[PDB]
């Protein structure tokens, strides 16, 4: 009926994928997930005539756009599109609507891999995934305002591989993406490949935006996971149930300790979550000097007769 937009956020990190390769019994798992993504994009473009596809990778040294290709294509030596430098990666008897998009994205994949190999000497401690789906929502709104309507949806191809834990800098931008996606009613679908069973922030992202979370552990047969569950278009979202069996608690980590929080305290100025009363009677975040009376009232003992 109404066409949609399939925006996809790919998490490419050499350390994460290679630790998945080492933990797994196979090498070259990203080729498998790449071709699974390609046939997913072909399935999405087969779903409707007018639906569109965006794919964005979040590499170590930043983010780059994979489809649609950057507008520097000028039918020149640096065009890098269509028959210009058309290196034979996929077969030429493909459907041309599929052929153009798949060939362009795999050329951009190889170009990103060349650029990341050229900067293999520097190891980034910062993950660019949160800014990646931030720009994904930005392009979603670009398509929504340019084309009048059209639905939209996000897919997240993330990987933990038991090496990267749940980071602290990935708290605020993820919920900014959650509220933005809730504003444009864009579902957020997340599949996590790796040994780490639970990713709490992404679980809340799927739950709060009417999306689906599915953690996976084997690179084989992932298109069953994708085209079985990740294909719920926004046209039929309310009439299809979700396989998101994992139940998230919508909790948070404490600031000065880091553990998952229970009934506790916050600063009434900087509003960070504290499992216990911080030392020095001052905030660890905004250095707000606290009244001794109120923390005496919170340190006050409950009463029972002798």
Could you say which residues in the range 2-61 bind another protein, by CB under 8 A? 14-15, 17-19, 21-23, 27-28, 30-32, 34-36, 38-39, 42-43, 46-50
Stretches 85-93, 125-133, 152-160, 184-192: which one binds another protein (CB under 8 A)? 85-93
Residue 238 vs residues 14, 47, 133, 211: alpha-carbon distances, Å: 38, 18, 23, 11
Q: Are 159 and 194 in contact (CB under 8 A)?
A: yes
CB 210 within 8 A of CB 237: yes
Binding mask 117-146 for another protein (x = CB under 8 A): x--xx-x-----------------------
Q: Note whether 53 binds Zn ion by CB under 5 A.
A: no
Q: Distance between the two ends of the chain, CA-based, in angstroms?
A: 72
From the CB of 268, what's the least distance to Zn ion, in Å?
Answer: 8
Show the tokens assigned to 131: 């800014």
Of the candidate residues 2, 147, 281, 288, the single one contacting Zn ion (CB under 5 A): 288
The yes or no reply on residue 1 touching another protein (CB under 8 A) is yes
* Exposure string for 241-275, b = 16+ CB within 10 A, e = fewer: ebebeeebeeeeebbeeeeebeeeeebeeeebbbb
Q: CA distances (Å), 288 to each of 115, 267, 278, 297, in order? A: 45, 8, 11, 18
User: Phi and psi dihedrals of 55, rounded to 5?
Assistant: -130, 135
Name the minimum Å distance from CB 90 to another protein. 6
Interface with another protein, residue 245, by CB under 8 A: yes
Nearer to another protein, 109 or 190 (CB): 109
Residues 191-230 within binding reach of another protein (CB under 8 A): 204, 208, 218, 220-225, 227-229
Of 53, 175, 256, 284, the one binding another protein (CB under 8 A) is: 175
Cβ closer to Zn ion: 120 or 303? 303
Q: What residues line the site for Zn ion (CB under 5 A)? A: 267, 269-270, 283, 285-286, 288
């Amino acid at each position: 009926e109404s066409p949609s937009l399939l925006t996809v956020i790919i998490e490419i990190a050499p350390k994460l994928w290679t630790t998945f390769d080492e933990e797994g019994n196979e090498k070259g798992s990203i080729i498998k997930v790449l071709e699974a993504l390609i046939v997913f994009l072909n399935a999405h473009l087969a779903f409707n005539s007018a639906n569109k596809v965006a794919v964005i990778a979040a590499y170590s040294q930043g983010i780059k756009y994979l489809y649609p290709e950057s507008t520097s294509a000028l039918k020149a030596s640096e065009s890098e599109n269509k028959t210009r430098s058309d290196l034979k990666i996929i077969n030429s008897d493909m459907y041309r609507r599929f052929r153009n998009v798949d060939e362009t994205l795999v050329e951009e994949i190889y170009k990103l891999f060349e650029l990341e190999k050229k900067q293999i000497e520097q190891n980034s401690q910062r993950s660019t995934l949160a800014g990646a789906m931030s720009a994904g929502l930005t392009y979603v709104n670009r398509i929504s305002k340019e084309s009048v309507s059209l639905k939209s949806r996000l897919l997240v191809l993330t990987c933990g591989s038991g090496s990267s834990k749940d980071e602290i800098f990935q708290y605020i931008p993820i919920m900014n993406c959650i509220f933005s996606a809730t504003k444009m009613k864009c579902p957020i679908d997340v599949v996590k490949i790796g040994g780490s069973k639970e990713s709490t922030f992404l679980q809340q992202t799927t739950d709060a935006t009417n999306g689906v979370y599915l953690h996976v552990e084997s690179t084989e047969g992932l298109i069953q996971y994708l085209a079985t569950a990740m294909f719920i278009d926004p046209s039929l979202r309310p009439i299809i149930v979700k396989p998101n069996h994992g139940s998230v608690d919508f909790r948070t980590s404490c600031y000065l300790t880091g553990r998952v929080v229970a009934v506790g305290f916050i600063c009434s100025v900087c509003l960070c979550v504290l499992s216990i009363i911080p030392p020095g009677n001052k905030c660890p975040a905004c250095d707000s000097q606290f009244d001794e009376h109120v923390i005496a009232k919170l340190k006050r003992k409950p009463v029972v007769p002798r």
